[PDB]
Ligand binder design. Structure first.
Ligand SMILES: Nc1ncnc2c1ncn2[C@@H]1O[C@H](COP(=O)(O)OP(=O)(O)OP(=O)(O)O)[C@@H](O)[C@H]1O
Ligand SMILES: Nc1ncnc2c1ncn2[C@@H]1O[C@H](COP(=O)(O)OP(=O)(O)OP(=O)(O)O)[C@@H](O)[C@H]1O
Lengths: 827, 300
C-alpha cells in the first residue's frame, strides 16, 4: 500500500546518489584554479543534497508511523533536487620550474649529501665495467630531491658521453618525454626533433640505436604512476656497462619497481636542526644572530613547526622579512597562531600550497575523504591507525562487492596506500604486528584542514580559531578541542559524528541524546560516566569509551542492531549485560580480561577481532562455543582457572578457525597444558606471541614445522629446556622476521649456559632482522657472515669461563649493521 | 519493455494488466530521462623490446618457417610470395616473425617491420613502411601529407630492382590489406612478404594457397614446463617437490600460450615463491569466478 511507493522511490534515490557521486568525483579532479565559480557553487549544492538523501535512505534502512515521515521527507528532497536542476541551466606553467634555476651558492648543507649520492653510484664507475644500475630517490612533498640530483649531475659530467634531465609531470605524454630525452642527448642532430611526429616506437628505436657503445647517465625525475615508467625502461634495455640512471619520485611503491635492490633506494631525510637554523638565518638575518636575543625562542618554535623541509622554511623566511625584518614579535605570534588553522589564506605563500596539493589531487577517489578525515584530530599527537580504520568503516568510506574481503583488510590497504604516497609518517609497531600510529606533517595538516573546511566536511572548535560558520543546521562532523566556552548545540539535528578531546566540559554542557541520528561516538579520555541514552541512538556504529570512568552501561544495548565497534579498555565495568548476544553485526570487541562475558557469544557470527578474552570460571560449552564463529583474525586470551582437559578442548576448537593472523596466550608460572602435540594449526598465522615469562613449555611444540604455518614472522617463545636441534628446526622456517627465545630453567634452576650449534644446512636464516636469545648462548662464531644477511641486533649470553676458550670467534664485521651490541655476561 | 511486448504479442482481461504495465514503464522511461539530464599506448608494444635470450623454443619453429619461405632463395628467381601466420591472442605470432626477420635480413636489400592496429589510418601505415625502408631519404616522411596515392607511388618507385622482405603484422579487416597489396604489384623475384593476423578468414585473402598459410600451435608440455620453471624458480625444479602437482595442474589450464604462462609466472613470484600450497590453490580455485579482478593482470 503506502510501503510500496516509498520502497520504489528508495532505489531511485540510490541511482541518483550514484550519478551525483560520479559527477562530484569528476568535478573534484581539476585543481580549484581552472574551475569556474558557477560550476563550483552548483557542485556544493549537489553535495549537500547528496548528504540529505543518504540520510533519508539510511533512516529507511535502520527503521525498516515512520513511513509517513519518510515519504514526506522523500517528496520534499525530490522537490529540492528538481528546483536546483533548472538554476544551472537558467544561468550559464609548473611552479617548480623556477626553483630549477637557483643560484648554486644559495644551498646550505648540500655538498655532503651530494657526495653520499655520488659515491653510492660511482664506486663501481671505478672499473666502469659493471652492468648499468639505477638509483632511485624518494621523499615527500618537496625536500631537495630534484636539486640534489642536479648537484650530483652537474658535478660528474666530464666522465661520460651523454646525459640529460627530463621531467615527467602528473599526466605525461610519452612522445613528449621521449623527444625531450632525444633532444638533450644532442641538440644539433635532433635540433628540430619536437616537430617530427612519428609514433611512440620509431623514436624509441632511434634513441636505442643512438646510445650504442656509450656511457651516459640519463636522469629522469618526478615519475609518478609506475605504469608510465615501464615504457621508458624499454628504451634502456641493451647492455651498456658503466652507464647509470637516476630516478626521483614521491611514490615509494614505484621505487622498488626500479633497480630491483633495496640498497639502491635512497630514502632522504629532512635537514638537521642546526642546518635548518643556519638556512633560516641566512635568509632573514643578514650576517649575525646575536642582536635579537628576544625572538630566539620564537625562531626555535617556528623552525620546529616546519620540521626540516627546505621548502617550508624558505617560504616562511621569505614571508617574514620583505625588507629588513618588517615584523617583530607581535605578528610573529599572530603567524604562529594562524598556522594550524588559517595561515595559508595569505600572499606569496600560495606558491607552495600547489606543490603540496599535487599529491592530494593525484590520489584516486575513495581516498580523498580518508585523507581529509585526518583534519579531525589535533595538531601534534600520534593517531592509532586502528581507530582510523574502524571510524572509516563505520562512516561508510570503505565498501566493496567482492565478498572475498573482510572489509577490514581493505581499510588497512587504504592506510598503507596513504603511507606509501609519502603523506603520513608511520611510527612504531603495534601489538598486532603492524604500524601502531601515524603522524602527519604540521604544514600539510593545517593545509588539509582548510581544504576540508571549504566544504562542511568537519567543524573544529578551537581557542586560537574561535570561529563559527553562519549555518548551524548544516553541520555533520564536530571535533571539540581545548575550547570549552561556546558549546551551542541547538541547531545541529542531523549530526553525522562527534568526538571530544581531553575536556572536562563534556556532559555538563554537552547534550548528546539530542542528536537523533548519529553514526559514531568517540569518547577517548573523558571522565564522564552517565551513558544511559545510547538506547535512543539506533544508527550508531562506532562507540569508543576507552578510559572514560564508565562504571556501568545500559541494559538495552541490544537494540543497536547496527554496530561495529565496542572499545571498553580502561573502564570501571566488570560485567557485560546479557543483552549483547542480541547484537547481530559486530566486527571488534575490545574488552579487558576482568570483565565477564554472558553466555551466548557464539551468536556473534560476524565478529572479526577479539581482544583480551578472560577465561575464569568457564564451563565446557562456553569454551566450545567460540569455535562455531569462524571469522576471527586477531585473538588475545588469558586465564587463571580452567587448566584441565578443557584446555585441549579449546585448543582443538581453535583449529576450526581458518582466518587467524595473530595469537597470544597469557598464563602465570605454569607448564602449558593447553597446546597438544597432535593438532593442526590454522593455515595462516603471522604473530603467535606468548608474552608470559613465568610460563614454559616442556619441549619444543611438534606442530611447529617449516611445512605448516609457513608465514610466521614472530615467536616470543619460552621453554624450560633448550636443544641444539630446536634452533636448527627454527632455522627451517621461511620468514620468521622476528626471533625471541627464553630459557626458563636457566633463570629458575642451576643450569649452565651451553653453546648450541647449527650443524645441518648452510644459512637457515635468509631474513631475520631481529634475533633474541635469553638464557641461551648464541655465539656469533656460529657461521660466517653469509648466514643471516639482514640482522640488525642480536642478543645472547656469554659465560665468563669461556673467555679463555677458543669458541668466541667474534671480531669480524658481519654483513648486517651488527657492530652495536652489549651482551649480558655472567661470572 | 521487450518482455512487455512479447507478453502482449503472445497473449493477443490481460489487457488491464498490460496497459497498467505500459503506463508505468513509460513512467520510469521519462523519470530516468530527466534524472540523466540533471547531471553533466599499446600494451603489447613494450613486449617487442624484450631480451632475445629469454625466449624458449623459438629456434625449432623459426628454422621451419625460414626454410619454408627461403627454400627458393637458392636460385632467387622465384616470384614473390607471402606467408600468413594465424593464431589467437598471444602465441608469439609477432615474436616468431621478428625472430625469423632478424636472422635472414643480411641477404635482402631492404626491409621494414610495420604494424597495423584495429582501426588503421592508411597514411600512417604507408608512412611507416616508407620510413623503415630508408631512414635518411625519408627521414621526416610523417610530416609530409600528400594523399593515399602519391606515397604509394613513392613506395613502388623505390622498390624497383630490389629484394625487400617486408613484414606486415596485425592485419584485421582484410579490406585494409587490399589497399596495401597495391604497393606490391610489380614483379620482384627474390623478395617476399610476411603477414600475421588473429583472423584466419583474412589469410586466404593472402598468398592464395593453403601450403603457405602457417597455422601455429601452442607450446608442448615439456617446453611449457621449462618456461614456467625458468621464470619462477631459480635453477632447479626438483627443489620444492611438494607443489609440483599444483604446478602441473595450473599449467594445464594455460595449456600452451606463452602469454598466460608468462602472466601466471610473474604473478606467482613476487619475491621467490611468496607462499606455497595455499596461494597456489588460491590461483587454481580463482580461475572461473574472480581471478581477473587482480593486479598487474589487467595488462593481459
Ligand atoms: N639544501 C638546500 N638548501 C637550500 N634550498 C634548498 C635545498 N634543497 C632544496 N632547496 C630548495 O627548496 C625547494 C624545494 O624544491 P625541490 O627541488 O626540493 O623539489 P623536489 O624535491 O623535486 O620536490 P617535488 O617532488 O615537490 O618536486 C627548491 O626551491 C629548492 O631549491
Ligand atoms: N616462444 C616464446 N617464449 C617466451 N616468451 C614468449 C614466446 N612467445 C611469446 N612470448 C611472449 O609472450 C608475448 C607474445 O606476444 P605475441 O608475439 O604473441 O603477440 P601476437 O602473437 O602478435 O598476439 P596479439 O594478437 O596478442 O598481438 C610476448 O610477451 C612475448 O615476449
Amino acid at each position: 500500500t503506502l510501503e510500496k511507493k516509498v520502497r520504489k522511490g528508495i532505489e531511485s534515490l540510490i541511482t541518483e546518489l550514484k550519478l551525483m557521486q560520479a559527477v562530484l568525483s569528476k568535478v573534484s579532479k581539476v585543481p580549484a584554479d581552472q574551475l569556474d565559480e558557477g560550476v563550483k557553487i552548483w557542485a556544493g549544492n549537489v553535495k549537500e543534497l547528496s548528504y540529505q538523501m543518504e540520510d533519508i535512505v539510511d533512516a529507511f534502512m535502520v527503521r525498516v508511523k515512520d513511513l509517513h515521515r519518510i515519504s514526506a521527507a522523500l517528496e520534499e528532497v525530490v522537490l529540492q533536487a528538481k528546483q536546483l536542476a533548472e538554476l544551472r541551466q537558467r544561468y550559464e606553467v609548473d611552479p617548480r620550474m623556477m626553483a630549477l634555476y637557483t643560484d648554486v651558492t644559495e644551498l646550505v648543507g648540500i655538498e655532503e649529501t651530494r657526495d653520499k649520492l655520488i659515491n653510492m653510484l660511482t664506486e663501481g664507475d671505478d672499473w666502469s665495467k659493471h652492468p648499468l644500475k639505477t638509483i632511485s630517490i624518494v621523499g615527500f612533498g618537496g625536500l631537495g630531491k630534484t636539486t640534489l640530483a642536479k648537484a650530483a649531475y652537474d658535478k660528474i659530467k666530464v666522465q661520460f658521453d651523454c646525459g640529460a634531465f627530463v621531467s615527467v609531470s602528473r599526466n605525461p605524454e610519452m612522445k613528449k618525454v621521449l623527444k625531450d630525452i632525444l633532444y638533450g642527448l644532442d641538440k644539433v642532430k635532433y635540433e628540430n626533433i619536437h616537430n617530427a611526429a612519428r609514433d611512440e616506437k620509431y623514436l624509441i628505436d632511434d634513441i636505442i640505436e643512438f646510445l650504442n657503445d656509450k656511457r651516459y647517465l640519463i636522469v629522469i625525475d618526478d615519475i609518478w604512476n609506475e605504469k608510465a615508467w615501464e615504457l621508458i625502461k624499454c628504451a634502456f634495455s641493451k647492455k651498456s656497462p658503466g652507464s647509470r640512471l637516476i630516478t626521483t619520485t614521491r611514490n615509494v611503491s614505484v621505487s622498488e619497481a626500479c633497480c630491483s635492490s633495496e640498497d639502491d633506494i635512497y630514502r632522504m631525510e629532512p635537514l638537521s636542526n642546526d642546518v635548518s637554523r643556519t638556512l633560516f638565518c641566512k635568509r632573514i638575518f643578514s650576517q649575525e644572530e646575536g642582536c635579537p636575543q628576544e625572538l630566539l625562542k620564537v625562531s626555535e618554535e617556528i623552525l620546529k613547526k616546519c620540521g626540516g623541509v627546505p621548502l617550508a622554511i624558505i617560504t616562511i623566511a621569505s614571508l617574514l622579512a620583505n625588507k629588513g625584518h618588517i615584523k617583530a614579535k607581535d605578528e610573529w605570534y599572530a603567524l604562529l597562531s594562524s598556522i594550524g588553522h588559517g595561515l595559508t589564506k595569505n600572499r606569496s605563500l600560495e606558491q607552495m600550497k600547489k606543490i603540496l596539493l599535487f599529491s592530494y589531487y593525484d590520489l584516486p577517489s575513495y581516498l580523498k575523504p580518508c585523507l581529509l578525515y585526518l583534519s579531525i584530530f589535533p595538531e601534534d599527537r600520534e593517531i592509532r591507525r586502528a581507530r582510523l580504520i574502524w571510524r572509516w568503516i563505520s562512516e561508510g568510506f570503505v565498501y566493496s562487492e567482492k565478498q572475498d574481503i573482510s572489509l577490514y583488510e581493505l581499510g588497512d590497504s587504504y592506510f598503507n596506500e596513504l603511507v606509501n604516497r609519502s603523506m603520513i609518517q608511520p611510527i612504531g609497531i603495534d601489538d598486532e604486528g603492524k604500524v601502531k600510529a601515524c603522524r602527519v606533517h604540521d604544514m600539510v595538516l593545517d593545509l588539509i584542514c582548510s581544504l576540508s573546511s571549504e566544504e562542511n566536511f568537519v567543524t573544529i572548535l578551537d581557542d586560537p580559531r574561535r570561529k563559527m560558520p553562519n549555518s548551524e543546521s548544516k553541520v555533520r562532523r564536530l571535533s571539540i578541542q581545548n575550547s570549552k566556552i561556546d558549546v551551542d548545540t541547538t541547531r545541529m539535528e542531523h549530526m553525522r559524528s562527534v568526538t571530544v578531546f581531553s575536556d572536562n566540559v563534556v556532559g555538563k554542557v554537552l547534550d548528546i541524546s539530542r542528536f537523533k541520528v548519529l553514526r559514531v561516538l568517540d569518547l577517548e579520555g573523558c571522565h564522564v560516566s552517565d551513558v544511559g541514552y545510547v538506547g535512543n541512538l539506533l544508527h550508531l556504529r562506532y562507540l569508543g569509551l576507552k578510559g572514560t570512568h564508565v562504571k556501568d552501561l545500559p541494559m538495552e544495548i541490544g537494540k543497536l542492531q547496527f554496530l561495529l565497534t565496542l572499545d571498553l579498555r580502561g573502564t570501571k565495568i566488570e560485567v557485560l549485560p546479557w543483552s549483547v548476544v542480541q547484537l547481530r553485526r559486530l566486527m571488534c570487541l575490545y574488552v579487558d580480561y576482568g570483565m565477564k562475558l554472558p553466555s551466548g557469544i557464539g551468536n556473534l557470527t560476524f565478529l572479526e577481532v577479539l581482544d583480551d578474552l578472560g577465561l575464569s570460571d568457564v564451563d565446557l560449552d562456553f569454551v566450545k562455543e567460540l569455535g562455531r564463529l569462524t571469522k576471527l583474525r586477531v585473538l588475545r586470551l588469558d586465564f587463571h582457572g580452567f587448566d584441565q582437559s578443557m584446555g585441549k578442548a579449546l585448543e582443538e576448537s581453535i583449529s576450526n578457525m581458518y582466518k587467524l593472523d595473530s595469537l597470544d596466550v597469557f598464563v602465570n608460572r605454569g607448564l602449558i597444558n593447553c597446546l597438544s602435540e597432535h593438532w593442526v594449526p590454522p593455515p595462516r598465522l603471522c604473530r603467535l606471541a606468548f608474552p608470559s615469562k613465568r610460563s614454559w613449555f616442556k619441549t619444543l611444540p611438534s606442530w611447529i614445522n617449516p611445512s605448516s604455518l609457513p608465514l610466521l614472522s614472530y615467536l616470543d617463545i619460552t621453554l624450560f629446556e633448550v636443544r641444539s636441534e630446536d634452533i636448527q628446526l627454527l632455522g627451517t622456517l621461511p620468514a620468521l622476521v622476528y626471533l625471541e627465545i627464553w630459557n626458563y630453567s636457566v633463570f629458575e634452576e642451576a643450569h649452565e649456559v651451553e653453546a648450541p650449534v647449527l650443524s645441518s644446512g648452510a644459512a637457515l636464516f635468509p631474513c631475520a632482522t631481529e634475533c633474541r636469545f635469553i638464557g641461551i648462548g648464541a655465539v656469533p662464531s656460529m657461521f660466517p657472515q653469509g648466514a643471516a644477511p639482514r640482522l640488525k641486533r642480536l642478543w645472547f649470553t656469554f659465560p665468563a669461563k669461556w673467555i679463555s676458550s677458543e669458541n668466541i670467534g667474534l671480531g669480524m664485521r658481519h654483513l648486517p649493521s651488527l657492530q652495536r651490541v652489549v651482551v649480558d655476561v655472567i661470572s
